[PDB]
């Protein structure tokens, strides 16, 4: 269908514990593919998906160059930010950037993204136009005005609009069997008596790709929200996801309840019954 490439960078200062920690991860859809750790012995962008291993040392070099350059930038910026928000040296802080791009089935552009946050709170973000910035505060305003004068936006768009989609095209061809797959859920159902007058009814969706799934409970066609428990979609650790939904029902009336599973890997929505 439609695809997305996303990078997530995390810089964490460690006062008196040496230099700050930079971690960067890259995903296509729900599949991670690259990593880089300031700490880890390597000091290279490492592959974390098979389709990426085919990439030359020329690829790995530039990727490492890029990432270290940001890491050093963040190093400086961590200090500039304490100066801004008048903070002590002893305290540890976090800089995070999340950037990417979406493409339609065509294989062409949809949107771009670049957003920053300092200590988990929104800092600055590039607008949908990829021409303007939004400053979250008085501090972020100095960064905005700086980036405005540097013409950062133009450069951002150039990547976001071009280079970004171009890599995506490539990663999707080169990694079709992994990335262009649709893994429908393994759907079962469990009953757990909590009384002789009550019982929890569980519905399991396991080993599915992508992570986007919808789990809905129904009592004879009528949608249920009255005493439904839904868990946060979690990963298998093998590159598929897990989600379950539960409901409290009166003993015996177990046959009255139905669960509907909506997933991209399903030709038509599934329905389970006890």
């Amino acid at each position: 269908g439609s695809h997305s490439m996303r990078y997530f960078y995390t810089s964490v200062s460690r006062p008196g514990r040496g230099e700050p920690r930079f971690i960067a991860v890259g995903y296509v859809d729900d599949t991670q593919f690259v990593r880089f750790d300031s700490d880890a012995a390597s000091q290279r962008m490492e592959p974390r998906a098979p389709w990426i291993e085919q990439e030359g040392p020329e690829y790995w070099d530039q990727e490492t160059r890029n990432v270290k350059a940001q890491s050093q930038t963040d190093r400086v910026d961590l200090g500039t930010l304490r100066g801004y928000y008048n903070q002590s040296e002893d305290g540890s802080h976090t800089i995070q950037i999340m950037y990417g791009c979406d493409v339609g089935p065509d294989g062409r552009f949809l949107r771009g993204y670049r957003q920053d946050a300092y200590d988990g709170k929104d800092y600055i973000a590039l607008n949908e136009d990829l021409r303007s910035w939004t400053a979250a505060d008085m501090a972020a305003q100095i960064t905005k005005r700086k980036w405005e004068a540097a013409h950062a936006a133009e450069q951002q768009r150039a990547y976001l609009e071009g280079r970004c989609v171009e890599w995506l095209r490539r990663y999707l061809e080169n990694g079709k069997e992994t990335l262009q797959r649709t893994d429908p859920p393994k759907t079962h159902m469990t009953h757990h008596p909590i009384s002789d007058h009550e019982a929890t009814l569980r519905c399991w969706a396991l080993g599915f790709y992508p992570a986007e799934i919808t789990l809905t409970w129904q009592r004879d066609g009528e949608d249920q929200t009255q005493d439904t428990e839904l868990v946060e979609t979690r990963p298998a650790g093998d590159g598929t996801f897990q989600k379950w939904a539960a409901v409290v029902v009166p003993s015996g009336e177990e046959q009255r309840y139905t669960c509907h599973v909506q997933h991209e890997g399903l030709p038509k929505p599934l329905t389970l019954r006890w």
Binding site: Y59, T80, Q156, R163
Partner: peptide, 10 residues
């Protein structure tokens, strides 16, 4: 692929 320059200081 990651973004190279800009990398403008905040």
């Amino acid at each position: 692929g990651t973004s190279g320059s800009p990398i403008v200081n905040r």
